[PDB]
Amino acid sequence: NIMTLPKIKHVRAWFIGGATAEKGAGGGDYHDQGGNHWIDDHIATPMSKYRDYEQSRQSFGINVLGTLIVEVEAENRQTGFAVSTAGEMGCFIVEKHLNRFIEGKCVSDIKLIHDQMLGATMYYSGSGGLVMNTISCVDLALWDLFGKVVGLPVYKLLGGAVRDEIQFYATGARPDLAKEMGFIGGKMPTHWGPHDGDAGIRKDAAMVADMREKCGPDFWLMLDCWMSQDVNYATKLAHACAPFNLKWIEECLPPQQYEGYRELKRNAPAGMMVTSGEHHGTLQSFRTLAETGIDIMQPDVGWCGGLTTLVEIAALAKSRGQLVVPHGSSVYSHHAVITFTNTPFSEFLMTSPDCSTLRPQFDPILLDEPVPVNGRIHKSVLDKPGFGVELNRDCHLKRPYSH
Amino acid sequence: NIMTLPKIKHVRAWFIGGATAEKGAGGGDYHDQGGNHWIDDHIATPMSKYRDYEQSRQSFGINVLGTLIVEVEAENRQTGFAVSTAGEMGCFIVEKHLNRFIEGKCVSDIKLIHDQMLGATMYYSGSGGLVMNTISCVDLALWDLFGKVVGLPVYKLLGGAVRDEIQFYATGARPDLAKEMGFIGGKMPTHWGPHDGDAGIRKDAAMVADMREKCGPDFWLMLDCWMSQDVNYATKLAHACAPFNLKWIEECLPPQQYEGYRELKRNAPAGMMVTSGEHHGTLQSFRTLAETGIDIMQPDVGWCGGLTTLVEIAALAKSRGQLVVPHGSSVYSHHAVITFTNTPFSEFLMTSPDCSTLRPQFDPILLDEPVPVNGRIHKSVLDKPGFGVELNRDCHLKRPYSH
Amino acid sequence: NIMTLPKIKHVRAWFIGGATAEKGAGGGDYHDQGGNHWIDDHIATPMSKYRDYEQSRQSFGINVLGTLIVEVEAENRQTGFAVSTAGEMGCFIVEKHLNRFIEGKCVSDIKLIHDQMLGATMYYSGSGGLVMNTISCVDLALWDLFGKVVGLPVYKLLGGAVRDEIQFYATGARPDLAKEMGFIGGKMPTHWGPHDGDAGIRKDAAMVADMREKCGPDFWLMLDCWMSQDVNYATKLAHACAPFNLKWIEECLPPQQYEGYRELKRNAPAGMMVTSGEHHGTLQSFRTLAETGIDIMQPDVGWCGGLTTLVEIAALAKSRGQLVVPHGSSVYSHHAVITFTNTPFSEFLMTSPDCSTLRPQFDPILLDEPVPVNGRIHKSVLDKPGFGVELNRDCHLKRPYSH
Amino acid sequence: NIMTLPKIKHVRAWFIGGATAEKGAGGGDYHDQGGNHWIDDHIATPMSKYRDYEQSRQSFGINVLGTLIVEVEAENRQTGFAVSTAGEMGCFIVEKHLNRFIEGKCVSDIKLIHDQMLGATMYYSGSGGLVMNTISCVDLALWDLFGKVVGLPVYKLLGGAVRDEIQFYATGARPDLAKEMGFIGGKMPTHWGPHDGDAGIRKDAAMVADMREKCGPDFWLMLDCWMSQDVNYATKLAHACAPFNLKWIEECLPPQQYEGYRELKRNAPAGMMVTSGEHHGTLQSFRTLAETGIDIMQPDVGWCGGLTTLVEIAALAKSRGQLVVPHGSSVYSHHAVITFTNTPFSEFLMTSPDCSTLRPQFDPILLDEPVPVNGRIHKSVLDKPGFGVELNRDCHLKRPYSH
Ligand SMILES: [Mg+2]
Ligand SMILES: [Mg+2]
Ligand SMILES: [Mg+2]
Ligand SMILES: [Mg+2]
Secondary structure, eight states, X not given: OOOOOOBEEEEEEEEESGGGSOTTOOTTOTTOOOTTOGGGSSOOOSSTTSTTSSSXXXXXXXTSSOEEEEEEEETTSOEEEEEEEOTHHHHHHIIIIIHHHHTTSBTTOHHHHHHHHHHHHHHHHTTSSHHHHHHHHHHHHHHHHHHHHHTSBHHHHTTOOSSSEXXXXXXXXXXXXHHHTTOSEEEXXXXXXXXXXXXXXXXXXXXXXXXXXXXXXXSEEEEEOTTOOOHHHHHHHHHHTGGGTOOEEEOOSOTTOHHHHHHHHHTSOTTOXXXXXXXXXXXXXXXXXXXXXXXXXXXXXXXXXXXXXXXXXHXXXXXXXXXXXXXXXXXXXXXXXXXXTTOOOEEEEOOSTTSOXXXXXXXXXXXXXXXXXXXXXXXXXXXXXBTSOEEOTTSOOBOOOOO | OOOOOOBEEEEEEEEESGGGSOTTOOTTOTTOOOTTOGGGXXXXXXXXXXXXXXXXHHHXXXXXXXXXXXXXXXXXXXXXXXXXXXXXXXHHHIIIIIHHHHTTSBTTOHHHHHHHHHHHHHHHHTTSSHHHHHHHHHHHHHHHHHHHHHTSBXXXXXXXXXXXXEEEEEESSOHHHHHHTTOSEEEEEOOOOGGGHHHHHHHHHHHHHHHHHHHOSSSEEEEEOTTOOOHXXXXXXXXXXXXXXXXXXXXXXXXXXXXXXXXXXXXXXTTOEEEEOTTOOSHHHHHHHHTTTOSEEOOOTTTSSOHHHHHHHHHHHHHTTOEEOOOOOHHHHHHHHTSOTTOOOEEEEOOSTTSOSOOOTTTTSEETOOOOBTTEEEHHHHOSSBTSOEEOTTSOOBOOOOO | OOOOOOBEEEEEEEEESGGGSOTTOOTTOTTOOOTTOGGGSSOOOSSTTSTTSSSOHHHHTTTSSOEEEEEEEETTSOEEXXXXXXXXXXXXXXXXXXXHHHTTSBTTOHHHHHHHHHHHHHHHHTTSSHHHHHHHHHXXXXXXXXXXXXXXXXXXXXXXXXXXXEEEEEESSOHHHHHHTTOSEEEEEOOOOGGGHHHHHHHHHHHHHHHHHHHOSSSEEEXXXXXXXXXXXXXXXXXXXXXXXXXXXXOOSOTTOHXXXXXXXXXXXXXXXXXXXXXXXXXXXXXXXXXXTOSEEOOOTTTSSOHHHHHHHHHHHHHTTOEEOOOOOHHHHHHHHTSOTTOOOEEXXXXXXXXXXXXXXXXXSEETOOOOBTTEEEHHHHOSSBTSOEXXXXXXXXXXXXX | OOOOOOBEEEEEEEEESGGGSOTTOOXXXXXXXOTTOGGGSSOOOSSTTSTTSSSOHHHHTTTSSOEEEEEEEETTXXXXXXXXXXXXXXXXXXXXXXXXXXXXXXXXXXXXHHHHHHHHHHHHHTTSSHHHHHHHHHHHHHHHHHHHHHTSBXXXXXXXXXXXXXXXXXXXXXXXXXXXXXXXXXXXXXXXXXXXXXXXXXXXXXXXXXXXXXXXXXXXXXXEOTTOXXXXXXXXXXXXXXXXXXXXXXXXXXXXXXXXXXXXXXXXOTTOEEEEOTTOOSHHHHHHHHTTTOSEEOOOTTTSSOHHHHHHHHHHHHHTTOEEOOOOOHHHHHHHHTSOTTOOOEEEEOOSXXXXXXXXXXXXXXXXXXXXXXXXXXXXXXXXXBTSOEEOTTSOOBOOOOO
């Protein structure tokens, strides 16, 4: 007997953080942290070749957007929400543009609202980043509302778990500690780039050699290069780290450089994986990325288009026999990837400043947000309506636009 | 507040039709019809080069499987079902094999049960047909149960319609009549094959020229070749029909002939589409099919793997900018393709013996099964729990196995 | 002076084994064995990533089909037969469908009956497995009858041996023992898959290293991976086993994954072979497989289409300078591959539960069925009419259909 | 009960014709005819650009080899034979070389004797022509003996007809007449080459236009260019003949020019076929030829390696979805191609000097050699032991070697 579905009454967007509020706010922006966080400690970037912007990513402006929160209220007064990285500018997009497609549709009209946001912003989105972050947030807000309205987890709507539990590896400066917390592997940032030559390679390879000595042969080790390299540097580094069984090397190149990724994968040591995707948006970009022949694609659910895009990226990887392993986005990834046969493991990105505690991935912004206890999360944990979390409204949410 | 989901208590399979029951039974088998149906009237096939098997497809055995019905009963006693083409042999598969993966899981455990059926039958399925027909049926049975248990249409679970109504073209011997019923186009079978040479081409092209004269320039015309041709014959025919603006030419080759399809598409008249897919199964086969560069892929939802496979095929086509237009499978396609932005139209395959009435696509087996009135179906029509239909149990359902 | 050939009066099919008879029946189904057989001892499969279906393949349903026996009787009352893996469902296919093409033709009309079975089942076979197993059995039944009617071995009909004796390697858990029995090499199953990571690789590589130490440098060692891997896992494993001169690594991927096989072969250690084919059916699939550039194709004569298909696969491999080495199917392979210049060796798959005795490949079902004594079989052994064996009718053959 | 097979006692070779006997002898050499035959009437060749060698092919030496006859006698005194084009030099090869592999083997040892002849002559055969003509003759001689010894047609040994009758088109100067004799089509030689420019094209195209006017639209028309062209000339000519629906254009280029054939096929009018093969020998050459993507390959059974090679070429074409249509070689082709599903028609090459009578294809040399009455040959006609013919020993057979 037919469940009756509400319309959509209001869409609202606030921000915490970024260049118009409290720097260090955390939440949706992973890199809105304080001083002396691991995530800002001399990480190789495109900018790190410049001496002012070598030490800190925060210095070049990695923290200026902050968290976007987008909330959608049905006319039965029930809400759903999600968070992403756009902040005040993303509030403008939701509130001076996108609201015309959200407001007044059914709660179940998610794909249509998605297609309309894609169609309408195509002239100014191009292909990812700020606009697509905003689009993904709306998309996830919508899936939350719908799962709450129905009284079901997103993961059951999507057709159920294919695994009882999600396995995690941990991202950050301390694989040794993450091994003690029960994680399956650990992914470190690179600290030196192309401008540092062989000394850079020696230095980053030595950090891998050390953690192999510490963690032993079965715990996975990976390197994350945040767009900082070229093909030759990436190939010298992949080969330096080969004696230590580096599982994969990740995001070596700026996202436009599809032909670079093709060539990098051709030059990779036998058995070593090349990965990318976290700065890619749209299904069609990921088609192009997949066909470079890289092993694993890594959308951020909050950056790539949303859960709607992500399920399509997973199908596309699976048609090719490839894995999709999203760039860790808490419950949003969780409800997705527990249904994906081609996501055998997931990413926890340490928001703990020294990678010693299981601090929540989206802390403070998300209430009862789960953590990988013993680097695992059981399916029974996610068994809450929608995405299973609530908005910490104690947080100092600014609202620069309404309509 | 969390909806509580039942386990799965029993899976049951019956058959109507095929070589062990009533020939002409209709239902899940499209080609289990009587004498003097359009669908058996001198249609070109792989076999039609043999004089005993030229006149009738029924003669070579196109009707021996019959309908499979698969029903799944939750422990709250609620059921879901679907129908496909496997019959008694499909009953064996469900009841001596597949039941070990269905029975005792949650109603929402569809993808897992899917993966398990794929994994376990891989040594004997290969890649489509009988075993995959059975797999798809179970898969659709499961989605019905789940949508009924939740009290929602499959189409809303999947994230909503992207169109208010499905547009249909009509398949069968009478495009002129289908134009009067309000259909957007009409697809005729070919009647002659390679062994008939130029006379075959002349004859089939003349049937297109005639219906172009009758239907005028805006109503679409297509040809369906049921695996009957080779590349050269298909290219001569595509070129003969070009003056008449044939929209596409469909299934020219046996499904293994990926390289043939590549070559056919290369040789197609400018602007004319090449299509295939209805005898393909598994996501991975469709990856291979897509990369031949054909324009439209055409899974049957009941033959290709199920709704679970189909949503992945749609994502895969959409990553490439291609359409997916399923081989018409009533409500099963409907609830799918009303959510697919890259399915702008759908197929109605005339089960009416002379293509003059809107006889139900799966008649008699499906109760309150919708028809394209004015070659359209509104989204509001599909707004019933699950797939929105019931099993005509008046039908003479035989049960050759239990467990 | 012209030998006069009988028509074909009757085709009959029985079964031993599977989910409707005696589990453990042996015969045509290689994997219809008892408890504590090597062939079910923790073998890596697509399913072995699931904890219920890790330990046993029998648990996921690898044994549910059982043996098909198909017998064809000429009107002079002479018979021929063969066995394969389809059982009761294959009995339906022979007896409610295929009999219309077999019954009433000449005994020498094998290719025609073959083409007709392929043409007629194309809409439900797709490309291999259950239906194709049935087709192959009929095909081999026909060649037996014809060779018996003529009073010649299949191998002489095909144009004679190109070698005095067939050399064998042995498949199963004990290469060391097989070396003592005089076999040229030994092929072990893998036990761990992708979900077991580096520990899985270490474990399987250590089992190869051990048997290299035992068998020494001239006895061949191979690994068989039964569809269980992905490209990366297969490449790590191939490279791990390279120090030990693993001759080849076999069936790493599900049969649809042609592009995976291409990529795997590209990544293989220099000099190491990649093989597949045993789950492929139809000549055209094998064209696609061949062009991935794998080294050896491995049809099962009883699964791929039959002896008629196999001779075409051998020609196709030989045009490319590749070997064909069939997946061991006793006399059916023997009479074939003793004529193939591009099959310099053959497979014996141990049906002996601990790989210590030369138990017959198709035990119990085949009377006076030869064994590789000293891992050889001389051509003079095969010098019997037809395929040279008889049907053990003491076996408890069930007949679920007649016509 | 086992038929007992004789050894091989003697191999003997004679010749009629060529530069050491009676010019105009006919038989195995198609082009050993008299003055004023159609087959020597101003046919375009590689040599026809030279004014001495324009008018006659006989002038440049097309007739110097003559017929080879090779006869093999078993120790039960039974014989088999065949004919080809090598004459006295082919007698040397059989009698000073190849006899070491033929003499003393079993009658059924055909493939082995084949492989041994290929292996041993590889240093001087290269890849076809004179040596391979000799090899093919031996091969066919062997199949005749074996079919006679067994008392069966070659066609039944190979596994039976797939068609009740062979359809023929006719090759030579008079398609109009061949249409009256009941042939399905007619293939004319070209008369002008590249050195004749546009006038050559106009002239040959006008001869096709004329016979289209005469024969009407359903009777097939083809052009045979005997190695005489380049790619550009062949493409201008194919396009000139397109208005008249020329079915195919054949052997435009010298056999080495694989890349030329690739390019020619790319440039062919839509729907028009490109063919070659009659001067190709060995399976491996035909692999290379097939992959140019030409439509039809055309071995001569007596030139390409023999019936043993031809069955492999047919399998190789069929794996690709291509036809094989042998260059007409009477019973040798017949017993082959009546079993080939991918030879839907065959070639009759007019040995009648003005193409008005059904003169035997191998006249005088072959006794009771069938003709396409009404351009057909029924399977029942071929139903004689071996290849079904006898050696006209009235003919003046010279024996230049024994051993
Ligand atoms: Mg990253
Ligand atoms: Mg169709
Ligand atoms: Mg194997
Ligand atoms: Mg020619």
